[PDB]
Ligand binder design. Structure first.
Ligand code: BCL
Ligand code: BCL
Ligand code: BCL
Ligand code: BCL
Ligand code: BPH
Ligand code: BPH
Ligand code: UQ
Ligand code: UQ
Ligand code: FE
Lengths: 278, 305, 255
């Protein structure tokens, strides 16, 4: 089987593809349409990657990048060595990942489990494009996107952010921040919490959930419950990239310069402070 | 199917539960516990019980006293009254050393002196909570993974705020009390130190952040989708494993190549969240005491774009 | 100088990260693992000198002194199985799937699979049970929302799947779990809650049909459920979205 419980659950199901031909597991893994399709944009992925570095990129797969196209080439398809390889590598990227996603929809057909996990994954891809396609799209060229490098595309974040002054002064950014830290913390709490209900002291039994709700409610004043943390878990990370995607589509299209200023519509409003008393 | 995950649809009520509590109910019991309608759709309903313990109050004496010293401290640069206080708010802050100085309690109670005080009680407040998430745990049965967990969090606050800005000298450093400038800080903190982007700790910390992001999302998911066989009440499945525990197990196995247990996941969790701020403190305890410029390091070894 | 570095350029900071990094690799595979407490060891056979493969990072037993009653279950248990499982072959590779060999949902295989769970009323911190209708409760009230209980029940067919009579809510936690059904000519039958659309005048499902609602795991205990029971019925349903409609595991569209 490969596993104890494995066996029982291995039935020719899923197949969103056709009906087999590509319904088998190659080891622990599950080979399907999206299996070779993923291997598709992956192969050609690592196939191509290695190339733009083969040009006289350099050494240490840290400073070898693939800079996107140039900004006078604004929307067209550029040659190659001069940053066209981003177009070609990123087309396969999208295919590479989403297919990975669908690949999952299969897996969760014979187990006949939630459609959840996959759906969660997309909100994830969404960001990807808004940063690479969409933003660049509503702005001009496949140029207001990031290079593809380890220690390089970290220059895109500084330069672009700073562009605006103190991104920190961004509506959404700011938001996606709060959001990130919460769920950042939050898992550690349900995370550190469970182990504890299932592995107390060292000579004391294995407690009941009745204690989980009791234990926390008996902390801040509220304990939301099992399902809770798990729906919660969903939002928070989900939201992170949601309100996140939101600000970076507001800079350049919606906004000109100085992110702080934005916050000044509030500052110098007629009535000053708006609503003094008398 | 579904919709028994998010939305809920139905709602059951009645009596209210409450566990042992080795150490008294005196304080406990508390307030009525007025259920919440549309609160019970997304989560439970019951608001309360709630403790009102020993260490639980000082965090308030303190915590409160603190909040104030600030709001009272963003007076001098206010003139007073609502319009003003309602104009900025986000702008106000309570600025640390100025003539700089060092680790001297500085120039009087004035300058930077007040930072001094408010900051001191946040020490008290926050430390009094640990007493609670910690000792409060011995009364219900449960263990202190929690408390410990919350200890890495005290590290970051500790360092950047108290521990960190001293191994150097000058109190000048350290995070001011605000909403807008306390932002500013972070920004000119990296900026002084080349770029906190070449700092290995902050970076792995960012590495870790997304990892808790990756992992919480996924977790809530692999459980909301198995919740059909009650993939939740994990603690029970930790005891005697159900097909739900597996079904989930099996999914990422035939996808990534490896599966855990309805118990390791939460383990990978605590762990992820923790290593978070953890490295970020190590990375702070070291920024300014061993490196004034980080870019150098990178191109002083081999890494940089 | 730079009262930091150690040699002709060997900063204290350098090893700091090597310390962290490897010792990090530490946790992972070992401590942070423990992900082998279940589904381990793995399934091997009988042959020649040495068997062609198997693990060894495998930790130690972790005795769990259960909530109430006799509490002793070290996770690193033998486990395994070998209980009735009717899954035949298809090809020659240890990937090539295995097909049903009878009644799929009826058998105990595939997207409609139950484990071999302990036989006992889940739990309850104050000793009792959890899972229980309201015909037993006293004080519990289903507020104005959706009161089946005499409300219709259907599937893909269309109607008379049965009527209602109650709900199995979370006594110790506060929340609805199962729903009581009676096929008119079949008294007991409690579907999940996590798969049946509730509304007004209809309580549409999806998993099954009023054609399969008869032959679902039955509760031998009137007003009492045990772990084992939950999963069977629980797998039963979920398994309609593939086994039910004969052609539900197949295609949809092309490419
Ligand atoms: C000086 C520079 C600025 C700045 C400029 C920017 C800019 C510019 C950006 C951010 C962005 C972000 N910033 Mg900022 N930022 C600053 C300071 C901060 C601070 C802080 C403590 O001060 C914080 C907490 C943050 C936090 C954040 C995040 C909320 C956000 C990116 C997260 C995200 O959605 O990733 C999501 C990641 C993805 C969606 C990646 C998806 C890729 C696909 C899906 C995966 C592919 C599969 C893989 C290849 C296969 C793996 C194979 C394996 C090898 C086996 N910033 C400073 C002040 N910040 C970004 C953002 O979202 O904009 C707001 C952004 O563009
Ligand atoms: C780490 C790098 C920088 C830094 C970078 C940033 C960046 C970047 C940002 C902030 C921002 C914030 N920072 Mg900061 N920040 C630093 C250090 C600190 C320190 C500290 C240890 O001294 C503190 C206290 C804060 C605090 C804060 C928050 C006030 C604020 C965002 C709120 C939030 O989501 O918090 C945590 C919030 C939660 C976890 C949500 C739940 C917590 C609340 C209290 C619960 C509400 C429940 C409700 C009241 C019911 C209560 C009922 C009963 C009373 C129980 N920062 C350091 C110096 N900080 C953000 C901002 O824009 O704020 C305006 C922002 O963008
Ligand atoms: C929105 C803001 C920016 C952005 C801002 C940043 C910043 C800022 C940083 C990165 C870093 C990373 N970015 Mg980026 N990044 C963006 C979009 C992307 C996209 C994409 C397709 O959209 C991809 C694929 C990546 C991918 C990556 C990773 C290669 C790398 C660390 C990932 C990580 O820790 O999480 C994945 C984590 C896991 C899967 C779990 C990790 C498990 C444990 C913690 C690791 C144990 C040991 C391990 C082997 C050591 C790894 C050390 C490496 C430094 C990570 N980025 C956007 C455009 N990115 C970081 C980096 O390289 O730091 C030096 C970094 O500092
Ligand atoms: C331009 C500025 C720099 C920068 C400067 C810094 C600095 C400076 C720091 C970080 C730190 C962090 N950075 Mg940064 N960072 C940048 C860009 C990024 C990017 C990105 C993709 O570009 C990312 C992903 C990150 C990500 C991160 C996080 C991993 C980390 C968060 C620490 C923290 O909040 O501690 C959380 C600590 C706590 C929550 C302590 C708890 C406090 C107590 C318990 C709460 C009491 C308050 C009260 C009770 C709450 C009620 C409400 C109150 C009114 C507030 N940064 C840019 C390049 N970053 C921090 C870090 O880890 O340091 C190494 C840090 O110090
Ligand atoms: C909000 C949702 C959160 C989330 C969820 C999530 N991620 C997911 C899933 C889910 C539920 C999956 O099911 C899937 C999975 O299998 O998880 C185990 C996955 C996954 N999330 C991943 C990454 C990931 N998730 C991220 C974030 C998040 N994921 C969110 C926090 C990030 C971020 C923010 O940085 C990253 C990097 C993958 C590890 C994994 C599945 C991706 C994958 O394996 O892609 C398949 C592609 C190949 C195998 C080969 C493609 C090669 C390319 C052609 C080349 C690309 C080159 C690249 C541009 C280089 C970049 C520079 C670097 C070298 C430095
Ligand atoms: C990996 C470590 C993560 C972590 C873990 C963690 N934090 C912890 C814990 C744990 C395990 C606790 O046990 C403790 C807790 O109770 O959490 C539920 C805590 C906690 N983490 C908190 C916050 C917090 N954690 C954060 C981060 C993190 N916490 C990390 C991500 C952050 C940030 C900046 O990112 C914040 C903001 C607290 C809510 C809580 C308790 C610790 C604390 O902050 O100290 C107690 C504070 C007081 C007693 C101050 C009293 C409040 C004053 C009355 C404010 C004045 C009025 C107020 C401004 C108006 C609003 C009033 C409303 C509250 C009604
Ligand atoms: C393991 O399973 C699980 C549990 O089980 C053990 C859980 O708990 C659980 C629950 C966890 C959550 C719902 C986490 C939510 C996320 C957070 C980041 C929590 C933050 C929530 C807050 C409300 C933060 C605010 C905290 C404070 C400490 C500030 C205010 C505190 C005070 C004490 C104010 C003082 C007031 C009084 C004492 C009123 C007094 C009145 C009289 C004395 C009369 C989950 C999810 C779970 O999965
Ligand atoms: C609550 O329920 C759950 C469980 O419990 C019932 C789980 O376990 C469980 C799975 C647990 C995990 C710990 C997965 C962790 C997710 C992340 C941390 C995000 C990172 C995602 C990845 C996919 C990491 C990517 C890659 C690697 C870690 C390295 C790649 C290594 C391999 C592919 C090993 C494969 C080996 C071979 C092909 C060689 C063949 C060897 C044989 C012995 C045959 C989940 C999710 C769960 O929710
Ligand atoms: Fe969980």
């Amino acid at each position: 089987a490969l596993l104890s419980f494995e066996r029982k659950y291995r039935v020719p199901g899923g197949t969103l593809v056709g009906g087999n031909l590509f319904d088998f597991w190659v080891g622990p893994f599950y080979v399907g349409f999206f299996g070779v399709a993923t291997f598709f944009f992956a192969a050609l992925g690592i196939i191509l990657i290695a190339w733009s570095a083969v040009l006289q990129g350099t050494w240490n797969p840290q400073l070898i990048s693939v800079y996107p196209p140039a900004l006078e080439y604004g929307l067209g398809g550029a040659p190659l060595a001069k940053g066209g390889l981003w177009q070609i590598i990123t087309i396969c990227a999208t295919g590479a990942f989403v297919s990975w996603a669908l690949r999952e929809v299969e897996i969760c057909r014979k187990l006949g489990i939630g459609y959840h996990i996959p759906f969660a994954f997309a909100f994830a891809i969404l960001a990807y494009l808004t940063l690479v396609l969409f933003r660049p799209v509503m702005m001009g060229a496949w140029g207001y996107a990031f290079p593809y490098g380890i220690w390089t595309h970290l220059d895109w974040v500084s330069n672009t952010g700073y562009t605006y002054g103190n991104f920190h002064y961004n509506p959404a950014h700011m938001i996606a921040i709060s959001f990130f830290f919460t769920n950042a913390l939050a898992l550690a709490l349900h995370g550190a919490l469970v182990l504890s209900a299932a592995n107390p002291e060292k000579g004391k039994e294995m407690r009941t959930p009745d204690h989980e709700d009791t234990f926390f409610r008996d902390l801040v004043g509220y304990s939301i419950g099992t399902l809770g943390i798990h729906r919660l878990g969903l939002l928070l990370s989900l939201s992170a990239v949601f309100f996140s995607a939101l600000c970076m589509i507001i800079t350049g299209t919606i906004w000109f310069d100085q992110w702080v200023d934005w916050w000044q519509w509030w500052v110098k409003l007629p009535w000053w402070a708006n609503i003094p008393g008398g | 199917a579904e919709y028994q995950n998010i939305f809920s649809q139905v709602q059951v009520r009645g009596p209210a539960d409450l566990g042992m509590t080795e150490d008294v109910n005196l304080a406990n019991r508390s307030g009525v516990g007025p259920f919440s309608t549309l609160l019970g759709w997304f989560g439970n309903a019951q608001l309360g019980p709630i403790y009102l313990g020993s260490l639980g109050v000082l965090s308030l004496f303190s915590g409160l006293m603190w909040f104030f010293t600030i709001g009272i401290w963003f007076w001098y640069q206010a003139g007073w009254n609502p319009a003003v206080f309602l104009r900025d708010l986000f702008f106000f802050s309570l600025e640390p050393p100025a003539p700089e100085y060092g680790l001297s309690f500085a120039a009087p109670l004035k300058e930077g002196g007040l930072w001094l005080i408010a900051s001191f009680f946040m020490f008290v407040a926050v430390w009094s909570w640990w007493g609670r998430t910690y000792l409060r745990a011995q009364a219900l049965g449960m263990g202190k993974h929690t408390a410990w967990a919350f200890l890495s969090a005290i590290w970051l606050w500790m360092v950047l705020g108290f521990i960190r800005p001293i191994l150097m000298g000058s109190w000048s450093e350290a995070v001011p009390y605000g909403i807008f400038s306390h932002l500013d800080w972070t920004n000119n903190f990296s900026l002084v130190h080349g770029n906190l982007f070449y700092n290995p700790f902050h970076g792995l910390s960012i590495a870790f952040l997304y990892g808790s992001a990756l992992l919480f999302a996924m977790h809530g998911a692999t459980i909301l989708a198995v919740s059909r066989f009650g993939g939740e009440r994990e603690l029970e499945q930790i005891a005697d494993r159900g097909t739900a525990a597996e079904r989930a197990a099996l999914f990422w196995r035939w996808t990534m190549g490896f599966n855990a247990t309805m118990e390791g996941i939460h383990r990978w969790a605590i762990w992820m969240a923790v290593l978070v701020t953890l490295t970020g403190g190590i990375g702070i305890l070291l920024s300014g005491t061993v490196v004034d410029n980080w870019y150098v390091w990178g191109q002083n070894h081999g890494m940089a774009p | 100088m730079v009262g930091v570095t150690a040699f002709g350029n060997f900063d204290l900071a350098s090893l700091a990260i090597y310390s962290f990094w490897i010792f990090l690799a530490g946790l992972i595979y070992y401590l942070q693992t423990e992900n082998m407490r279940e589904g381990y060891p793995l399934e091997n056979e009988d042959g020649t000198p040495a068997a062609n493969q198997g693990p060894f990072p495998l930790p130690k037993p972790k005795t769990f002194i259960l909530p109430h009653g006799r509490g002793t279950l070290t996770v690193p248990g033998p486990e395994s199985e070998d209980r009735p499982i009717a899954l035949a072959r298809t090809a020659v590779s240890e990937g090539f799937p295995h097909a049903p060999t009878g009644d799929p949902m009826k058998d105990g295989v595939g997207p409609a699979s139950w484990v071999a769970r302990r036989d006992l009323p889940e739990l309850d911190g104050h000793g009792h049970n959890k899972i229980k209708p309201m015909k037993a409760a006293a004080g519990f009230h289903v507020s104005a929302g959706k009161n089946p209980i005499g409300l219709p029940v259907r599937g893909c067919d269309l109607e008379i799947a049965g009527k209602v009579v109650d709900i199995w809510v979370d006594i110790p936690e506060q929340m609805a779990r199962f729903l009581e059904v009676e096929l008119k000519d079949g008294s007991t039958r409690l579907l999940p809650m996590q798969m049946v659309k509730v509304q007004s005048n209809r309580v549409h499902v999806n998993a099954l049909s009023s054609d399969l609602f008869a032959g679902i795991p039955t509760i031998k205990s009137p007003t009492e459920v045990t772990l084992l029971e939950e999963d069977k019925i629980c797998g039963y349903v979920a398994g309609g979205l593939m086994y039910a409609a004969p052609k539900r595991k197949s295609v949809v569209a092309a490419m």
